[PDB]
Design an enzyme around this catalytic site. Structure first.
Site, PDB file in Angstrom:
ATOM      1  N   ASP A 195       0.839  -1.219   0.000  1.00 43.43           N
ATOM      2  CA  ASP A 195       0.000   0.000   0.000  1.00 43.43           C
ATOM      3  C   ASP A 195       0.864   1.254   0.000  1.00 43.43           C
ATOM      4  O   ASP A 195       0.699   2.071  -0.920  1.00 43.43           O
ATOM      5  CB  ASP A 195      -0.960  -0.010   1.193  1.00 43.43           C
ATOM      6  N   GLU A 238      -0.944  -9.858  11.217  1.00 42.89           N
ATOM      7  CA  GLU A 238      -0.785  -9.319   9.843  1.00 42.89           C
ATOM      8  C   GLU A 238       0.693  -9.028   9.539  1.00 42.89           C
ATOM      9  O   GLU A 238       1.114  -9.204   8.389  1.00 42.89           O
ATOM     10  CB  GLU A 238      -1.660  -8.053   9.757  1.00 42.89           C
TER      11      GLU A 238
HETATM   12  O1  LIG Z   1      -9.585   1.574   5.620  1.00 38.71           O
HETATM   13  N1  LIG Z   1      -9.999   0.316   6.178  1.00 38.71           N
HETATM   14  O2  LIG Z   1     -11.342  -0.016   5.951  1.00 38.71           O
HETATM   15  C1  LIG Z   1      -9.056  -0.497   7.050  1.00 38.71           C
HETATM   16  C2  LIG Z   1      -9.588  -0.900   8.290  1.00 38.71           C
HETATM   17  C3  LIG Z   1      -8.839  -1.614   9.236  1.00 38.71           C
HETATM   18  N2  LIG Z   1      -9.439  -2.013  10.508  1.00 38.71           N
HETATM   19  C4  LIG Z   1     -10.836  -2.420  10.576  1.00 38.71           C
HETATM   20  C5  LIG Z   1     -11.468  -2.163  11.949  1.00 38.71           C
HETATM   21  O3  LIG Z   1     -10.536  -2.107  12.982  1.00 38.71           O
HETATM   22  C6  LIG Z   1      -9.398  -2.903  12.845  1.00 38.71           C
HETATM   23  C7  LIG Z   1      -8.635  -2.704  11.536  1.00 38.71           C
HETATM   24  C8  LIG Z   1      -7.506  -1.957   8.991  1.00 38.71           C
HETATM   25  C9  LIG Z   1      -6.938  -1.570   7.784  1.00 38.71           C
HETATM   26  C10 LIG Z   1      -7.661  -0.878   6.809  1.00 38.71           C
HETATM   27  N3  LIG Z   1      -6.779  -0.582   5.624  1.00 38.71           N
HETATM   28  C11 LIG Z   1      -7.058  -0.830   4.200  1.00 38.71           C
HETATM   29  C12 LIG Z   1      -7.267  -2.333   3.885  1.00 38.71           C
HETATM   30  C13 LIG Z   1      -8.411  -2.690   3.194  1.00 38.71           C
HETATM   31  C14 LIG Z   1      -8.629  -4.021   2.886  1.00 38.71           C
HETATM   32  C15 LIG Z   1      -7.688  -4.992   3.273  1.00 38.71           C
HETATM   33  C16 LIG Z   1      -6.531  -4.649   3.958  1.00 38.71           C
HETATM   34  C17 LIG Z   1      -5.484  -5.774   4.303  1.00 38.71           C
HETATM   35  N4  LIG Z   1      -4.623  -6.000   3.389  1.00 38.71           N
HETATM   36  C18 LIG Z   1      -3.710  -4.879   3.132  1.00 38.71           C
HETATM   37  C19 LIG Z   1      -2.498  -5.442   2.400  1.00 38.71           C
HETATM   38  O4  LIG Z   1      -1.509  -4.346   2.311  1.00 38.71           O
HETATM   39  C20 LIG Z   1      -2.867  -5.868   1.118  1.00 38.71           C
HETATM   40  O5  LIG Z   1      -1.608  -6.324   0.386  1.00 38.71           O
HETATM   41  C21 LIG Z   1      -3.715  -7.028   1.279  1.00 38.71           C
HETATM   42  O6  LIG Z   1      -4.010  -7.558  -0.018  1.00 38.71           O
HETATM   43  C22 LIG Z   1      -5.039  -6.627   2.098  1.00 38.71           C
HETATM   44  C23 LIG Z   1      -5.839  -7.829   2.274  1.00 38.71           C
HETATM   45  O7  LIG Z   1      -5.120  -8.651   3.167  1.00 38.71           O
HETATM   46  C24 LIG Z   1      -6.313  -3.317   4.286  1.00 38.71           C
END
Ligand SMILES: O=[N+]([O-])c1cc(N2CCOCC2)ccc1NCc1cccc(CN2C[C@H](O)[C@@H](O)[C@H](O)[C@H]2CO)c1
Ligand SMILES: *[C@@H]1O[C@H](CO)[C@@H](O)[C@H](O)[C@H]1NC(C)=O
Length: 765
Positions: free
Chosen positions: A538, A735
């Site tokens: 990312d 993670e």
């Molecule tokens: O903005 N958010 O909705 C958001 C919320 C939360 N929360 C939720 C409620 O509280 C606890 C944590 C955490 C992080 C995000 N970040 C953006 C995001 C979106 C979708 C997947 C991932 C994880 N991976 C990122 C990897 O970098 C990628 O490579 C891989 O493919 C992907 C799938 O594993 C990250």
């Protein structure tokens, strides 16, 4: 025979607990059909149940942990839930019983044991929620003999085109059932199992929690209306016990109340099978599935020194069972911007402002419906399909059950549109959309993701060259069947390759760019000032500002991976015209990796841009991106460039931490900055690629064999022990891991590519 293996894999895999977004539920691999869900919560007051009740997976201070101790989707598994808030240790045992023409029968035992801290007389409400979608299907609760509810088993009788005739039994169960001497007991009974049979339009049946609470509230509205008041209130557990009203409908709520420890069974009996399932069947089949899991695990995942110990074996089974136990069946519409707005071509400077304006037109519409059968990164946080994650998830799953892995790959490639695009993120149906903010649902047909699914096909091809047990290896044991699978997939794989070259093209020609090839250069679409989400890394630092002249060395390496796979599969299929084209492309990528991305000054590969003065500039941020040609296996083992990369990998002052390789060098100016997601932490997926490639070099004559063997030995040990120590202290796969402290950080339950650790332990790649 391919046809036959097909029918047998469908029938084997039809039923499962394919709802990983909830603690426990079942559904078949059919869009509109029978779904089950488990709910539970303590009730200590008139207002606490709404706050205690469990349904959808979360992780907070109120849940110690949960996960599968054992799982195989053909046979079933046992799940442990450790609930601090509700004072409960729960076991959900699920087992499949083959027979008949409709994907067979299944059984589950729900066991609740109060922990030491809980009041011995705690009252726990338990709900089994059953729903059925389909225009010409039926489901009916057989009434009880008794006035107010059920003294024994609850029997649901059902019919659909898909399932045929079935019965679903919620057994009486063991445990104390609280009794009320209140006046209300004259009208609601002293306390007993109850069933309410309802109908809502098919598309809301998934909203189990609001449908339940709407019934509970009607119950409480009735008490207020009928003079049950604060002068003499019924006990809380009786205020929250539904009036029995069984019947026919597309929703059936089975509610029990227990005082202390409890257990009950769910028996699903496909009429087209023999005798209906019994609790004795359940207990026998659970014993068997456990013996079979044990035997397969010691074969498939034989852990090598220094991880032979029982402690590492328990760890491996947990990491593996949570990964394969995460397999879900998803069905519904996807939200997709099909505008192909020209701002999405990103051919201008400042292209991210243009792309923003196109998105703000909000031309996305629901499309499909679609279906996906896939493992997931995270039950509580990311319970859906991620394109490059799945490549990592299927490497251990394919070892266990190559035919299951191929079903999932097939399911993913059935999503591809006419152009060769699969959405990187699969949000299928309202149930899936509920876990995702509106702003982040929309998929874009110009956004790619690493094609890691090719790495699994590579493992299958090597295996294809060199009844449940039978089905699990039928596509490599019957080479006819394996070749025929590749023949149908091959055109899709080639369509994706062409889609990458068309949509993710870099600009050589329009700048002062010298290279062996004018064709081979690539740029990830979709990048913003601080991000490149499509790359999967990312916030890894990229050229600043983003620019239409950018070239990304990781994207070129991924195309390299794709061509090497198409050469292999094309050869097996004798697509000679195709194999000749691929070979020229591979030679061109090998040369242009050097001409466009190699820094002699830095001793590593780098992304490129064009300057203020319109000249090609390398932009070197030492970290995972810098290693990519090595990580994807594009480098000759005698390459001086490889040797320089082994020096960077091993250098403690750059990427080498006691806990694994840092995503970014400690020397880089962006080390530990901003969100620090891919700017220092240790990620198991890229470490796994590096461990596999170090092993490749360690098991060949060449000038770096011994450097590679030493680095392989230590890296394997550092990664496994870091993930192991954290699992031991916390019960979680994390993670990513902190390179200073070794602690797991960001999201828990990441099984998820962190589970690659089972494969690193068993070695011999
Ligand atoms: O903005 N958010 O909705 C958001 C919320 C939360 N929360 C939720 C409620 O509280 C606890 C944590 C955490 C992080 C995000 N970040 C953006 C995001 C979106 C979708 C997947 C991932 C994880 N991976 C990122 C990897 O970098 C990628 O490579 C891989 O493919 C992907 C799938 O594993 C990250
Ligand atoms: C399973 O088989 C049925 C009929 O043979 C078919 O309609 C369905 O597509 C198969 N599986 C999936 C999810 O495609």
């Amino acid at each position: 025979l391919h046809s036959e293996i097909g029918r047998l894999n469908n029938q084997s895999l039809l039923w499962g607990p394919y709802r990983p977004n909830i603690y426990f539920g079942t559904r078949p691999r059919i869009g509109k059909s029978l779904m089950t869900g488990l709910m539970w919560g303590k009730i200590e007051s008139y207002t606490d149940f709404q706050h205690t009740v469990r349904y959808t997976c979360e992780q907070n201070e109120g849940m110690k942990g949960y996960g599968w101790d054992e799982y195989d989707p053909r046979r079933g598994g046992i799940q442990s839930i450790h609930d601090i808030q509700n004072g409960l240790d729960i076991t959900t045992s699920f087992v499949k019983i083959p027979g008949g023409a409709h994907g067979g029968s299944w059984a589950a035992r729900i066991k609740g044991t109060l922990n030491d801290d809980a009041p011995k007389d705690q009252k726990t409400i338990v709900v089994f929620y059953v729903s059925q979608e389909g225009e010409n299907s039926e489901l009916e609760a057989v009434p009880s003999e008794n006035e107010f509810g059920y003294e024994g088993d609850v029997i649901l009788k059902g019919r659909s085109e898909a399932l045929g005739n079935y019965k679903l039994v919620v057994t009486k169960g063991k445990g104390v059932i609280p009794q009320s001497d209140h006046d209300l007991s004259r009208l609601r009974g002293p306390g007993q199992t109850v069933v309410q049979s309802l109908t809502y339009p098919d598309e809301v049946l998934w909203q189990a929690k609001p449908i339940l609470f709407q019934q509970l509230k009607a119950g409480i509205d009735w008490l207020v209306e009928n003079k049950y008041d604060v002068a003499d209130p019924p006990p809380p557990w009786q205020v929250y016990l539904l009036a029995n009203k069984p019947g026919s409908g597309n929703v059936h709520i089975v509610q029990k109340v227990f005082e202390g420890d409890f257990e009950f069974d769910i028996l699903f009996s496909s009429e087209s099978a023999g005798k209906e399932v019994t609790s004795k069947d359940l207990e026998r089949e659970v014993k068997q599935a456990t013996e079979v899991f044990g035997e397969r695990f010691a074969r498939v995942f034989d852990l090598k020194a220094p991880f032979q110990g029982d402690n590492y074996k328990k760890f491996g089974k947990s990491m593996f069972s949570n990964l394969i136990g995460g397999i879900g069946y998803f069905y519904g519409h996807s939200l997709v911007d099909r505008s192909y707005a020209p701002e999405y071509d990103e051919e201008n400077e400042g292209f991210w402002e243009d792309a923003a304006e196109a998105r703000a037109r909000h031309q996305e519409a629901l499309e499909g419906p679609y279906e996906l059968f896939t493992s997931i990164p995270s039950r509580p946080f990311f319970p859906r399909g991620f394109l490059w994650d799945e490549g990592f998830h299927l490497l251990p799953i394919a070892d266990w059950d190559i035919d299951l892995a191929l079903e999932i790959i097939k399911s993913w490639y059935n999503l591809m549109d006419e152009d060769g695009w699969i959405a990187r993120e699969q949000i299928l149906g309202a149930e899936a959309r509920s876990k995702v903010p509106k702003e982040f649902q929309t998929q874009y047909p110009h956004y790619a993701n690493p094609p890691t699914l090719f790495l699994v096909l590579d493992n299958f091809v090597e295996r294809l060259r060199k009844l449940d047990e039978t089905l699990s290896t039928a596509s490599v044991d019957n080479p006819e069947v394996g070749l025929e699978y590749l023949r149908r997939l091959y055109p899709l794989l080639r369509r994706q390759f062409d889609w990458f070259r068309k949509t993710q093209a870099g600009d050589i020609k329009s700048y002062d760019r010298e290279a062996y090839s004018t064709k081979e250069a690539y740029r990830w679409r979709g990048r913003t000032v601080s991000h490149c989400l499509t790359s999967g890394l990312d916030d890894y630092p990229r050229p600043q500002p983003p620019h239409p002249g950018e070239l990304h060395v990781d994207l070129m390496s991924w195309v390299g991976v794709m061509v090497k796979s198409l050469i292999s599969i094309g050869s097996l299929l004798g697509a000679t015209e195709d194999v000749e084209f691929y070979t020229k492309v591979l030679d061109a990528i090998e040369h242009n990796l050097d001409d466009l991305h190699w820094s002699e000054k830095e001793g590593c590969y780098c992304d490129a841009t064009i300057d203020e003065f319109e000249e090609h500039k390398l932009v070197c941020h030492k970290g995972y991106i810098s290693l990519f040609p090595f990580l994807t296996g594009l480098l000759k083992p005698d390459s001086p460039k490889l040797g320089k990369l082994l020096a960077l990998i091993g250098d403690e002052s750059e990427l080498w931490s006691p806990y694994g390789l840092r995503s970014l060098s400690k020397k880089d100016e962006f080390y530990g900055t901003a969100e620090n997601y891919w700017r220092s932490p240790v990620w198991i997926n890229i470490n796994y690629l590096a461990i596999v490639q170090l092993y490749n070099i360690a098991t060949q004559d060449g000038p770096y064999k011994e450097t590679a063997r030493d680095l392989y030995t230590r890296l394997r040990k550092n990664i496994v022990e870091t993930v192991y120590r954290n699992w031991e202290e916390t019960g979680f796969a994390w993670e990513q891991y902190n390179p200073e402290t070794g602690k797991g950080q960001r999201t828990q339950h990441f099984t998820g590519w962190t589970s690659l650790v089972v494969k690193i332990m068993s070695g011999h790649h």
